[PDB]
């Protein structure tokens, strides 16, 4: 239990907004029994350069809590234990099909201003909760923006970004503007580049043959699309096992790049789909 | 009454546990064996830190003199003739209740704090001082740290040499930990990007990290162990909620 | 509420009796320094 | 004894210190001799 106290008296509109906002994950860095206005939420970091991946890294470092039982200016945050059941109100604009794993993502800046809190040069920046599929999708897009923006053209950076950025998952359009192009993608691409070099050097003889053998036997239309992208074996089988194991491990590494740690596992969903129950903590 | 700790009774021949029959709280390793009568055989952390490459020659020969008999010589030969290390030996837990019979009985804790019974003198994990390092942005950041064990290999032109590291970090996230470990380990990593192609031994990575569990920041204390007068500097974690997780490899 | 009697160190500043002391006895042996 | 912490401050854990002061030890000695003629005339009168 972490009690928050803002030291500043809030109005009835503020207590109505927090009553609307009850049962939401808020991350804290402090790990004390007491927190205040300075450490609550994500505003004490989102003034430093506003970089999405920077917020993502420190948000990985943060310690997550659940809002509970606001008694006026005092604000209970439960520290939720491992694998126990907890009720979460959602903020991500999604339809939230049950049983999927959930991660915790930096807030994608919508054009409309937030109505959560703005009080005395301090807002309540709440990070969103998303499914792991669209989380990995966003991380793919981050890595891809760096792969393209290491390459340099004039009036083509905008041509890549405006086509790529607006994505749709479960009838929801989101976008990520103003990428600073830091070297974050360069390191997290550099180990990918290393691993793709290893996939090249360690990939077996069966597999790139397996394309041509599959195509020369039979054909399918998605195989013809893969062909568009494309354009003796005398008992070496333990070597083949080892090479396929190495290629699989490189794919595990590049998957561990774009993967985000699942923070929640959904069991029951309300019909309004504002609150859902989970049984997980990392 | 109440316990809530998870233990396992253990039979192991008494030759391998030479100082670890005296100082409670040690990491233990499962070593499966193609010999069918001892299918599993249990290995001391210091016993495998013998042929770890991190350990300097003085500490290595000192604990080799703590670790010289015929049975240990044969087991070290078996470990060296194993191709890789990390899935022929394996992490198993923390020592409590040495019995020292003929074939000695060991309790071993999977989860929870390290205590036999009656909850007097709750023991702690004992790590050799050479074999750990804390790569982090700020050391001992705010509060309690997660303790991980990392196996790292090295290749000096003949064979593979394994190396045993222990990291202590405030980061819980395994992705953040492997991202700071690649920054620590990049040099020998590029050496293995050279090596793993020309190698034919069935391995696929540079090392792997696995969580032991929680510690406490104010419960880290220095000291030494001594068996037959061999003073050996150790850093003793005091109260440990043992929380094993999966192995996470990195290349 | 109940009333008791105790001693304080006073000063006289123009017919003003002012208690005058140090908090070192409660900051003798703690974790914090004296906040002054 | 510790002080209660306010907002945003680490509560320090309860600290118990045990020390043990050893003893230094220091002997002293004093020598004085007696001569053999002093020892002869000390105990007996030879004749009165």
Chains within contact range of chain C (3+ C-beta pairs < 8 Å)? D
Residues of chain C contacting D3 with CB distance shorter than 8 Å:
27, 30-32
d(CA B201, CA B82): 10
d(CA A38, CA B242): 34
Phi and psi (nearest 5°) for C24?
-65, -25
State the DSSP H helix or E strand holding residue A132, giving kind and residue range, or none if neither: helix A132-150
Q: Which residues pair with D3 in a beta bridge?
A: none
Residues near B31 by beta carbon (within 8 Å), at least 6 away in sequence: B40, B41, B42, B43, B75, B78, B79, B88, B89, B90
Under an 8 A CB cutoff, do D12 and C31 touch?
A: yes
**Phi/psi-derived region of residue B97, left when phi > 0, alpha when psi is between -120 and 50, beta in every other case:** left
Pick the residue from chain C with its C-alpha nearest to D10.
C31
Touching status, chains D and C (3+ beta-carbon pairs under 8 Å): yes
Nearest Cα neighbor of A40 from B169, D7, D4, B173 is: D7
Paired tokens of A90: 């959602």
CA distance A5 to chain D (A): 8
Residues near B88 by beta carbon (within 8 Å), at least 6 away in sequence: B31, B32, B79, B82
d(CA B53, CA B85): 13
Q: Do B108 and B8 form a contact (C-beta atoms < 8 A)? A: yes
Pick the residue from chain B with its C-alpha nearest to A184.
B179
Under an 8 A CB cutoff, do C31 and D1 touch?
A: no
Q: Do A67 and A16 form a contact (C-beta atoms < 8 A)? A: no
Touching status, chains B and C (3+ beta-carbon pairs under 8 Å): no
Q: How was this structure determined?
A: cryo-EM
Residues of chain D contacting B218 with CB distance shorter than 8 Å:
13
CA distance C12 to chain D (A): 33
Residues of chain C contacting D1 with CB distance shorter than 8 Å:
29-30
Instruction: Give the pairing type, strands B89-98 and C17-19.
Output: unpaired
CA-to-CA dists, residue A136 to A133, A190, A261, B222, D45, angstroms: 5, 18, 10, 43, 118
d(CA B60, CA B83): 22
Q: Is D11 on the interface with A (CB under 8 A)?
A: yes
d(CA A115, CA D25): 78
Nearest Cα neighbor of A4 from A55, A47, A41 is: A41
Pick the residue from chain B with its C-alpha nearest to D12.
B218
Residues of chain A contacting B204 with CB distance shorter than 8 Å:
242, 245-246, 248-249
Nearest Cα neighbor of B30 from B20, B19, B22, B42 is: B42
Q: Do A117 and A149 form a contact (C-beta atoms < 8 A)? A: no
Q: Which residues pair with A275 in a beta bridge?
A: A89
Under an 8 A CB cutoff, do D7 and A34 touch?
A: yes
Pick the residue from chain A with its C-alpha nearest to D6.
A34
DSSP letter (8 states) at residue D5: P
Interface size A-D, in CB pairs within 8 Å, comes to 19
Residues of chain D contacting A38 with CB distance shorter than 8 Å:
8
d(CA A94, CA A141): 19
Instruction: Give the pairing type, strands A101-105 and A85-89.
Output: unpaired
CA-to-CA dists, residue A246 to A201, A204, B90, B214, angstroms: 10, 10, 20, 32
CA distance A39 to chain D (A): 8
Under an 8 A CB cutoff, do B251 and A250 touch?
A: yes
- Per-position DSSP letters for B47-112, written without gaps between them: HHHSS-SSS-HHHHHHHHHHS-SHHHHHHHHHHHHSSSSTTTEEEEEEEEEE--SSEEEEEEEEEE
d(CA A228, CA B88): 44
Q: Is D13 on the interface with B (CB under 8 A)?
A: yes
At residue B213's C-alpha, the angle toward residues B208 and B218, to 5°, is 120
Under an 8 A CB cutoff, do A35 and D8 touch?
A: yes
Q: Is D25 on the interface with B (CB under 8 A)?
A: no
Pick the residue from chain B with its C-alpha nearest to A198.
B193
- Give the residue from C27, C30, C31 with the most D CB atoms within 10 Å of its CB, the best one to mutate: C31
Residues of chain A contacting B250 with CB distance shorter than 8 Å:
253, 256
Q: Is D8 on the interface with A (CB under 8 A)?
A: yes
Touching status, chains A and D (3+ beta-carbon pairs under 8 Å): yes
Chains within contact range of chain D (3+ C-beta pairs < 8 Å)? A, B, C
**Coil, strand or helix: which one is A222?**
helix
d(CA B243, CA B237): 15
Residues of chain A contacting B201 with CB distance shorter than 8 Å:
242
Pick the residue from chain A with its C-alpha nearest to D10.
A32
Strand order from edge to edge, sheet including A101-105:
A85-89, A275-279, A264-269, A101-105, A128-131
Pick the residue from chain B with its C-alpha nearest to D14.
B218
Residues of chain D contacting B143 with CB distance shorter than 8 Å:
10
Residues of chain B contacting D13 with CB distance shorter than 8 Å:
218
Q: Do A141 and A176 form a contact (C-beta atoms < 8 A)? A: yes
CA-to-CA dists, residue C6 to A29, A165, C9, C19, D17, angstroms: 46, 75, 10, 12, 34
Paired tokens of B123: 């023991």
Count other C-beta atoms under 10 Å from residue A6's C-beta: 20
In the numeric block, the tokens 């561990």 are attached to A256
Q: What's the resolution in A?
A: 9.0
CA dihedral A245, A247, A253, A258 (to 10 degrees): -130
């Amino acid at each position: 239990t972490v009690y928050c106290t803002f030291d500043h008296k809030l109005s009835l509109s503020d207590i109505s907004t927090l009553c609307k906002l009850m049962n939401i994950v808020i991350p804290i860095p402090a790990h004390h029994h007491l927190i205040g206005s300075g450490n609550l939420g994500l505003y004490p970091i989102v003034s430093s350069n506003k970089d999405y991946v920077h917020i993502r890294n420190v948000l990985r470092t943060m310690v997550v809590t659940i809002l509970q039982k606001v008694e006026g200016n005092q604000l209970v945050l439960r520290k939720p234990m491992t694998g126990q059941q907890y009720a979460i109100k959602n903020t991500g604009p999604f339809p939230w099909e049950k049983g999927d794993t959930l991660t915790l993502i930096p807030p994608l800046s919508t054009h409309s201003e937030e109505k959560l809190l703005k009080l005395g040069d301090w807002e309540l920046t709440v990070p969103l909760v998303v499914p792991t599929a669209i989380a990995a999708e966003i991380n793919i897009r981050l890595l891809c923006i760096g792969l393209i923006a290491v390459h340099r053209e004039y009036n083509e950076m905008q041509t890549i970004i405006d086509e790529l950025c607006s994505i749709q998952y479960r009838d929801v359009l989101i976008k990520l503007p103003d990428i600073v192009n830091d070297k974050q993608s360069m390191y997290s691409m550099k180990t990918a580049c290393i691993s793709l070099s290893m996939i090249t050097a360690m990939a077996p003889d069966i597999v790139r043959t397996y394309i041509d053998r599959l195509t020369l036997e039979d054909h399918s239309m998605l195989l013809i699309k893969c062909q568009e992208l494309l354009s003796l074996h005398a008992t070496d089988i333990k070597d083949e096992l080892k090479k396929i194991k190495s290629v699989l491990t490189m794919i595990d590494q590049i998957n561990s790049l774009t993967n985000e740690k699942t923070y929640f596992v959904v069991c029951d969903v309300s019909a309004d789909n504002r609150m859902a129950t989970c049984i997980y903590k990392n | 009454r109440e316990n809530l700790r998870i233990a396992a009774r253990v039979f192991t021949p008494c030759e391998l546990l030479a100082p670890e029959l005296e100082n409670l709280g040690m990491l233990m390793y499962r070593f499966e064996t193609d010999v069918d009568n001892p299918k599993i055989l249990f290995v001391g952390l210091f016993f495998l830190c013998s042929n770890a490459f991190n350990v300097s020659a003085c500490v290595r020969t000192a604990l080799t003199t703590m670790y010289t008999n015929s049975m240990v010589d044969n087991v070290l030969s078996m470990i060296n003739t194993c191709k890789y290390l990390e899935d022929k030996v394996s992490l198993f837990g923390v020592t409590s209740l040495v019995s020292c019979g003929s074939s000695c009985l060991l309790s071993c804790v999977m989860q929870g704090n390290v205590y036999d019974a009656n909850k007097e003198n709750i023991h702690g994990l004992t790590v050799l001082k050479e074999i750990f390092l804390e790569p982090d942005w700020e050391p001992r950041q705010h509060s309690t740290q997660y303790v991980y064990v990392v196996h790292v290999y090295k290749e000096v032109l003949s064979k593979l040499q394994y190396g045993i590291y222990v990291v202590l970090t405030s980061f819980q996230n395994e992705d953040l930990v492997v991202d700071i470990l690649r920054q620590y380990f990049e040099k020998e990593r590029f050496l293995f990007l050279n090596y793993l192609i020309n190698s034919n031994t069935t391995l696929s990575y540079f090392g792997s990290v696995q969580r032991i569990g929680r510690c406490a920041t104010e419960d880290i204390k220095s000291g030494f162990l001594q068996y037959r007068g061999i003073t050996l500097p150790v850093i003793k974690l005091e109260n440990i909620f043992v929380d094993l997780s999966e192995k996470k490899v990195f290349v | 509420r109940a009333y008791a009697d105790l001693k304080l160190n006073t000063l006289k500043l123009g017919d003003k009796l002012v208690a005058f002391d140090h908090l070192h006895k409660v900051y003798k042996n703690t974790d914090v320094n004296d906040p002054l | 004894p510790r002080v209660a912490t306010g907002n945003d401050v680490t509560a320090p854990k309860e600290t118990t210190i045990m020390v043990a002061k050893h003893s230094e030890k220091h002997p002293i000695n004093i020598s004085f001799d007696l001569s053999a003629a002093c020892l002869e005339h000390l105990e007996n009168t030879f004749k009165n």
